[PDB]
Every structure is written in C-alpha cells, then in structure tokens.
Amino acid sequence: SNFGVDFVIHYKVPAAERDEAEAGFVQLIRALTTVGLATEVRHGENESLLVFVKVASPDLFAKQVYRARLGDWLHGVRVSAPHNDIAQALQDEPVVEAERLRLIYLMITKPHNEGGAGVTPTNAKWKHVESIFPLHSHSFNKEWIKKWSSKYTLEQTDIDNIRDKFGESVAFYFAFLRSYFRFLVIPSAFGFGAWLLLGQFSYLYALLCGLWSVVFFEYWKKQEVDLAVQWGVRGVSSIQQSRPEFEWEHEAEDPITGEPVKVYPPMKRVKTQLLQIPFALACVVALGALIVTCNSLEVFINEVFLPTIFLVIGTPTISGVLMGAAEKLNAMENYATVDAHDAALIQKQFVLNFMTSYMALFFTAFVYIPFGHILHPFLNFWRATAQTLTEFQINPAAISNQMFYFTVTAQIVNFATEVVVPYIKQQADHEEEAEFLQRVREECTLEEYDVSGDYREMVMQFGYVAMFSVAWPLAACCFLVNNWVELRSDALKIAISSRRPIPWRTDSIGPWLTALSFLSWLGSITSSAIVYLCSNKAWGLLLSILFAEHFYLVVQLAVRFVLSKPGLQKERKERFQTKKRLLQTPEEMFWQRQRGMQETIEIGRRMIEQQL
Template identity: 40%
Template sequence: MDSLLKIPPSTPIIRPSIQTPGPYQETCNDKYVVKYNFADLDPEEATEELKTLLTDLEEAGLQTEVRAGYDETLLIFVKAPRELLGNTVYKSRVKDWLYGVVHDHPGGTKNTVVDAHYESEDILSVYHLVHWSKEHGGAGIHPGIGQWKNVEAIFPLHNQRANQKLLSHLSKRFFLTAEDLDKIRDIWGSKIAFYFAFLQTYLVFLIFPAVTGVVAWLALPKYSLVYAITTCVWCTVFVEYWKLREVDLSIRWRVRNVAQVKTNRPQFTWERVVTDCAGRKHYFFPKWKQVVRQLLQFPFFGIATAALGLLIVSVFAIEVLISESYEGPYKFYLEYLPTVLLAVALPYITSSLEGVASALTQYENHRTEDNHERALAQKVFVLNIVTNYLPILLTAFVYVPFGDDVVPWLEVLIGKVLGKVLGQQQFAKRPFQADGDRLRNEVIALVVTGQISGFFEENVVPFVRHRFSGWWREMRRLRHSRDGRGADLMSLFDDDPDEAAFLTRVRDQSMLRDYDVQEDIAEIVLQSGYLALFSPVWPLIPLGFLVNNWIELRSDFLKISIEHKRPHPVRTDGIGPWVYSLNMLSWLGSISTAAIVHMFSTSGWGPARWASLPITIFVGEHVFLLFRTLLCFLLNQLGSPQIREERSRLYATRLQRLEELEANKRNGLGLTAAERERRRSMRATGGDKLFTRQVEEGVSAAVGVDLIRRFKEAAESKKKK
C-alpha cells in the first residue's frame, strides 16, 4: 500500500464525475467496476497507466470515479450517462433486427434514447461500452490481456435488494414457472437463466424415474429389463423436449440466433480483413489452419486418457485386491476407501487437465466467445467421461466377467507392495469368486461421494475461503495498526460516512471469484450421464439426484449472489454445446444399458452369453434411434406456444406490410393524375424506348391527329389526280 501513497495526488486520477453516494446505493443498472492492481508497478508507471485507463473510459462517453480497494488495488467506478446508455440499448436492438435476431424494427433514429425492458439489458450495454473495442464504440478494456494485464477484473454490482427478494420468492416454490425464469433473466441475463431453466426442466423430469426407480428397487428383480427400457425412453424424451424448450425460451427472451451479433474475442488474431457488399468487415483466419490446430487435441486426449486410465486402474486393482483377498482389520472401511479417495481427487485432477484443454482451445484461435466455449466444452466433456465413467465400465466389463483371470495376477503384483505395509498374513490365499454386487457398490460409492464432495466444493469451501480471507485482512490491519503502519493504511479507506457501507460491499465483491456457468451445466450433464448409462445397476440413483437438484436449484442462486462476482449478462440462445453431449449420452446409454442388462440380469458367463451380446447391443441401439426419430417428428409437429406465436406474429407482420403496399398502390403514393397516368403507361409498355419517349413527351394524341390529317390530304390529292 505504500506505493499508492507515493502517487502524486493529481486531479486526473481522482475524477469526481459521479455524484455519491446516492447513485451507488440506489441503482446498479448503469454502473461497472474496474479493478486495477498496481502491486508490481512503480508509482510513475502506475500513474501513467491509470491515466490511460481513465482516458479510454471517458473517450467512450463514460464517467469515472476512483476509490481505494483492498491490498494494492484501485476500484474505478464507471457510470454510463442516461443519454449514452439509452442510445446504446437502442442501437443494440437495431443490430438485433439487422441480423435477424428479432423481426420487428424498434423504430426511431440513430440518436433515439430508450429505456431498457429489464435491468440486465442496461448492464449488458454498459458491459459493451467498457469491454468492446474502440472500433465498436467501447473503451476496449480486456482484463489481463495486452496493455490491460494489470486490470484484474471488470464486473457489475450485485443488486442485493433484487437478489434477496427473488431468493425469498424462490425458497417458497417447489418448481419454478416461466415468470420466475424471466425474473432471473432480468437480473443476470439469458445465459444464466438458461442454466436455471435447464436445471428446472431436468428436476421436473426426474420425478418419473425417481418413482419408477423406487418401484423397481422394491418389486422388480435386479437389472430389470422393464426399468432399463423405461429409463432409456425417459432419457430420450427429456433430451428432445429440452431442445424444444430451448427454442421456446430463446423466442420468449428474444435471443434466438443471437450468436450472429457476437463480436470478435480480444484474443482472436486474423490474417486479413474482407469487406462484403454491405460494407461489413469480416476478420478472416484460414479454416484449414484452425482444423490443423484442433488436431492437437487427439494426442492430448490419448495421453490424458492413458494417464487417467492408469490411475483409475491402479485404484481399482487395489480395491479389488483388498475386497477379495484382504482379511485384516478395518476391511469394511478399506474396501471402498480407494474409490472414495479417487472420487474426491478426480475434480482436482480434472481441473488440471481442463487447464491444458483451455490452453489448447486458446491456441485454436476461435473468433467468438461462443465458438471458444463450444470447443472447450467438447474437451471437458470427453475428460469427464474418462474420469467419471471409466471405473464403472471397468467393473462391469472387466472385473466381473474376467475376474478369474485378472485378480490372481493382481494378487501377486500388488500383494507384494501392500503386504509390506499391512503384513503378508493379512492376505488370504483362497480361490477367487467375482462379487456380482460389486458393480452396484461401485456406482453407489462414486455417485454418492461425487454428489457430497461436489456440494462441499461448490458451496461450503468457497464460503469458508471468503470468510477466512476477510478475517485474515482484518487481522493484518490490526497487526499493522499496532506497529505504526495502520494509520497510513486506514487513511486510504477514509470513506465518506454515507459511502462507507456501500464501498465495503464493493471491496468484498471485488475479492470474489468469477462465476462460470459452464461448470454447473457440465455437472448436470455428467449427472444425467450416470442415469442414462447405469440406471439399471441401482434404481435409486434418480431419487438421490432429485433431492440433490432441488437443493442445488436454490443453493446455486445463493451461491451466485454471495460467493461470486455478479456475472456479465451475456446473451445466448441455449446451453450451447451441452445439447450435443446430452444427445451422445442418451445414445451411449442405449448401448450401455442393453449390455448391462444382458450380462447381469441372469447368472452365468457362458460362450452363448458373449456371442449374443453384440446382437443385443445392435437391437437396443437401433430401437433407440428409431424411437428418437419418431419422437422428434411428433414434437416438431406439436411445436410449442412460443413457436406458434412467432409464426403467427411473422404472418401478421407480412400481412400488414402487404396491406400497406396495396394501400400505397391504391392511393398512388400521393402522385398527381398525370404522373399516375404516365407510370401506368410505363408499366404497360414494359420499358420500350419508343413508347417511353412518346409517353414522356405527351405527344401520342398529337401524332395520331397529324397522321390522320396527312392520310386524308394524301387521299384527296390522289382523287384529284
């Protein structure tokens, strides 16, 4: 903090262009906060960089004011004046109309100022003014990129009053209505609202497999074919219904095909700029180069899969050896301890691999943020399949059918290592017999442990970390006050009494993590994969998911409100590439479910069982494909209220336009009688130059009369002769 005290108190740094404290405390829709960290800069360099930052913001028409933040940071409050904000909202609507996102022109002129329909529409416009490049009318502030590497973050302010009101409302409802989702969209934008809509739809659909799962667990035999078929049908119906629901909501929120208006990512590099016939600039990067770069993901997946597979196989082997051969104390706890530890460690391992995947995706050089997220999501999905489903697949298709050959070899290999730790006498030499219940126990251990650890990782750990960091800052401040440095530190926070509470909240928000909705969507997609692939193993899986997701729906809203910075209200028209992941999981589920029921529904592992397995998989897969095709046809025929309403609205718009043309035609567009006659003649002639010349000169009648006179004179002259 000492370096801040050395910065000359020149007027260009603290610019009192925002009236405080009222606007800060009363409104959140017209403000953003830029967090600037100067810890690694000397005072002169920090001063010049800060002046440049403020100048760029003000050149975009924004008002700025600077306050001290925690540690060696500054908080730059940015406000969009009423005229600028309203005009930016209007231009955004016009752009949506130009690119076909909406079909009705908003009216007005280029200087029109309008009010936003909801809060996040205003905040999105402020985000554009701060984040977009100068070419597009913004300040071009990109945190951590280029000249703004010392800008830690830009974020809007939480509307605590609206958050608390909506949280109180949601806590009283078992299911969310479309109006509740509208309110979430109004606060956080369509991208976050689509996640809650997806989670809500999934939660409603879970009721059916939860009920049938309890019935199957109580009344049906293990690995029931009836329950397996019912669950496969449910998974297919859920995926296809969500596709329709996604389109429905995108029309309702007026964001369908909104990807057409997305600008370039600041990290995107292009080779040349092409201008089309409409004057639009297209930034071109060769597609073949991007495809070549994308090929690097295949060796990455190969290495990651091999490494993760080796780790999972090792844990699996240790667990099998303990459960089948170990006869020492605490066997009940040691038997599934490796799987529990693996389930706890996998999120951290996956996070490290996702960092590599993110670097590869960055190297692929995607133009828009949507394309970048789509490519990254595909890599994360593949990693999740390997880390979460491989242990169960090994148990189902390696341990149980081939355990007689594999486990004795593992006893010799691993028993030597663990025998030194636990004692050779603890390992009994007895004939191996595969445990048919092990697959179910494996699924229970991974699913339950994963849900519990995920809840603590998402909700408890961030809350404790945030509380601890606040306690640590306060302890450090008290320690500095005792050694004489506290006075200098506190002088930086000499806040106006009317601003103090508000500024403390903003400083706390600046220390929170950014919220990434893709992580939460990936969690739900992964959860649905357990249900699609392994539901016959343990029919109570959907019941546990139903309880977990009901809590998740409320805790996620609280998590975003308290544990994260307010997310940018970015617009999307769905959950992005995760729809394709759901499609793939439902297809894989038809194969996995058919194989599991075929292999485990009856005892015995004879050659006939293996010989008929490909036939079972083939039939199950093709029945699934046929059912999905028929379901898609039926749902498309039924449509949805929003789709039908949009079609009716488009028809009404075209009909109104046609009537206007007919009216203009009847009224002659206000032309004189002579002009209407001339245009009628022009249309009749089809543009022939001879007729056009006579019509324009207005001599048709005179020429005819003259020709008659001349013919008569010629006839009289001939008679006289």
C-alpha cells in the same frame, strides 16, 4: 442499495513500475470520458484504485440503445423495427436491467471502430486493468433466496425475474435445471416401482430409461426454442461476435461483402490442434493405470471398499489440474469468434470429465465381469508385496455396490466442496458511506462465476442416470433430492459467493445439446449390455444390443414425429400482421372473326345445333 453505480474497474498498480502506470491510467480515463460515461475514483486495497462509472446523459444512452435495437433488427433477431422517434420505444417495451448492463459493458469494451473505447485487459497495453464487473444488490438477494427456499415448485415468473435481472445464460441454465428436475420424477417413480417388485437387473427398465431420456431430450429441445422466442433472444447464435485476444499476421480482402478482416492460415491452426489426441491418450493411459491399481487393491482386501472411497475423494484434485492444463492448451491455439472458442473448451472439458467419471464403472462392468484375468497380475503383485511386507475370486456383481458408493458417497462430497468449503473460506474522504466501500472491496476479491461447470455437473448426472441406473434403480431417488437441493445451492453460490456475472445473451444452452444426445445413445447400449452381463453364450449379447439400439432409434423417430405437431404460432401471427400492415396473316386474321363475347355464345350454340 448501491449508489446508482453501474460498473467497477480495478486497475491495480505496481511498486517498481508506478511511472508507467500513471500514463496508462490517464489514457484510460481520457478514453472513458470521451464516450460519455460519468466516472469517479476511490481508494482500493493492496495497490488498487476502484473506478466507478455509470451513464451520464440519458439522451446518449437512448441513442445507443436505439442503435443496438436496430442492429439486432437487421440481423433477424427482431421482427418489428422501432420507429425513428424515441418517445414510446422505452415506454411500450422498457429496457430491463440486464439489457442496460450489457449495453454499458459493450460500450466500455468495444473499440473506437464501433462506437466504444477498447479497454480489454488482455489484448492492448491494458496490463494494469484487472477486471470490469457490475455490482450486486443485497436487497434483491435477501428476498430472492428466502422466496425460493420457502416454496416447492418454481413458476415461470421466478425464472423470468432472473432473466430480467441476472442476464440470459443464467436464466437458461436455471430453466434447464428446473425442467430436468421436473422430468426426473418419472424415472424416480418407475425405478422405485421396479427396485422392490421387479427383481434385479430387469430388461424392461433399460428400455424405459432409454425412452424417458429421448422424451426428455426432445421436450427440452422444444421448450428451448419456445423460451428463446418468448424472451426475444432467438437467432442470436448466428451473430458471430469477435474476440479481442485473436492474433493475425495480415489482412485479407473479402471478395463478397468486403471489410477489413483478419485471417489465420488453417494449416497453422491444425498443426497445434491435432496435439489434443496424443495428450488425451497420455492422460487417459495414466488415469486408467491409477483406476486399475485402485480396483486391484479394493479386490485384494476381499482376500484379507476403502480404495474406491479414497479414489472418489482424491479425484477432484487431479480433475482440476487436468482441467486447468486443458484450459491452458486451448489458449495456445487461436480462435477467431467467441462462439468457436467457447464451443471447443466445452468439448475438451466434457471428454476429460467423462473419462474421469464413467471409466471407474466401465472398467468394473465391462472388463472385470466378462474376464477377470487382466487383474490377475495385479493381484499377484499385491500379494507378493504383502508377503514381502513381513485363490480364485469371481465377483458375482460388484456394479451394484459400486454404483451406490459412486452416487451416495459422491453427491455428499460434491455438495460439501461446493457449499461448505466456500462458506468456511468466507470467514477468512472516509465519510458516512465507508460501509459501501468495504462491501465493494470485499466484492472484487471473489471469483467470476461461470455456468460451464454447473452445466457440466448436471450433464454428467443425466449421463449417470442414462447409462448406469439399471444397476441401481434407486439412483434417481437420490438424484431427485440432490437436484432439489442444488436448485437453491447454485442460487446461493451465485448470490453470496461470487461476483455478479456480465449478462451475455445466448439463444441455446450451447454445445451441451450434442453431449446429451451422445450420452443417451451410449447409455441405450451400455444399459442393455450391463443387463445381459449381470443377469447371465456371446451370441445373445449382440442381439440384445441390436434390440436396444434399434428401439432407441425408433423411439427417437416416433417422438420427433409426435412433437413435430407455443411461440412459433405467435411469431407467425406477428409476421402475418406486419405483412398485412405493409400491404397497404395467321394471328390478326384468326381471332378477328370472334372479337366480342356475345357472338361467341351464338356461334357455339349454332355449332351444337348443327352437330346433331
């Protein structure tokens, strides 16, 4: 439905600095025109000038895509270079929309040293440029949402459509979510089969959960490389993309393969990097104190679960401000590549969300149950406060109720915040095309969509399954429905409540693979510990931990060995085919006695005859 547009830039302007903005606009448009993109300017809103661009000459676009395909080829991404004749390259393997959008964005963003015109709104003097974004297509979305909501199971072609259009990382996230939702059936079924017929806090369920977690992790790891090979996006993690916000002080010549490269003394970076530990300790101390007071108030009411519900409802705000502070801190220290910078924010975000999510259960299952004397002083303080306003309690198992109140009453709140609140906030010259202009203006005021949060939510849901499902086997039953709803909720959020993300290629899901392994390993211990501490000396607990951890390790080894036996065979066949295609006195006087071959047999026969 769009007018053939490709990219839109905002370029807000000030009121007391309009003189300094006209020169910047002139420089920006002059740089943009030299690259070879067709541009147009239209009135925006609240001091904005929308700039719409696409590629003008298809010949230059073909040259650029050929150069990009070549550059991918020499980096090992491809295994078949294209011929130096642009007649079948876009015919046998036509360019997809995502690839064209990525190439246009790379041409717009890269500096002159590579073939582009650097207009990054952060590094250089482009302080007036707000954001560069592509446009949506309502015709595609109205059909996609209905098609996805009118079915039950998503086939491979449904994910391939998102890969073709919406990019690569989004496709990987959706494939991972679909695979995880499909795999969640087994723990759901075998927890429903143990919640009604296998007593409470069964020991078999913990081992079964550990085995299922290992199997799912390894199967997803295999399907990951399979999908990477299928989409031809394997090995892109090796490409070290640079960053525009990087800062340096001097250029250091590289002895081997030397081009001008910027460097940062590692000692200076570490001097700021180690600041994370004191900040993490200071934040976790305060959060633990808050949890302690909340649980003390909750247990005081037993002497006459509201504090737990209030804490769950109120923790999103503190989590958000702490996450914003962590994001701000990551900018204080500098990263050269964009992979390292993105792999460092994920670690901090995961640590913070883990400590703000699992610690409420940890302080109730591993602290209050073994020895509740720690909460004694808090109980006494609360009793004294209640008395001034005008004996011994032993909890049998509070983990069962807390897990239910942390799953059922938290999934609803999370879904409400994710869907309904944006839905409610969504209701808060001049020729015959102004509808498109109004749509564009309403599009640029939204927020850029990032897959980090959606990955984090699913990672921590998997953790909740891994380390705490033994206290409530019905958790997977609710999680199945929640994930089925989420598979369309996230699609809707992408479609209507967020601008279309810039397609970025990625081989893997990122550093989340290590997080899943760590969560599974820790769950393999915590589940058995909870089973022992709830089912009721101290010698047996360590033995149970031994059995659980070593069974987990043995299961991991066995599953790896089994799965060591797809797209790898197709790649090997292609490599073999291309290989076949490219395929097309003591010396002079010693053996002078026996020159030819015929007499040697005669000599041997004579030797045999004489031997007898």
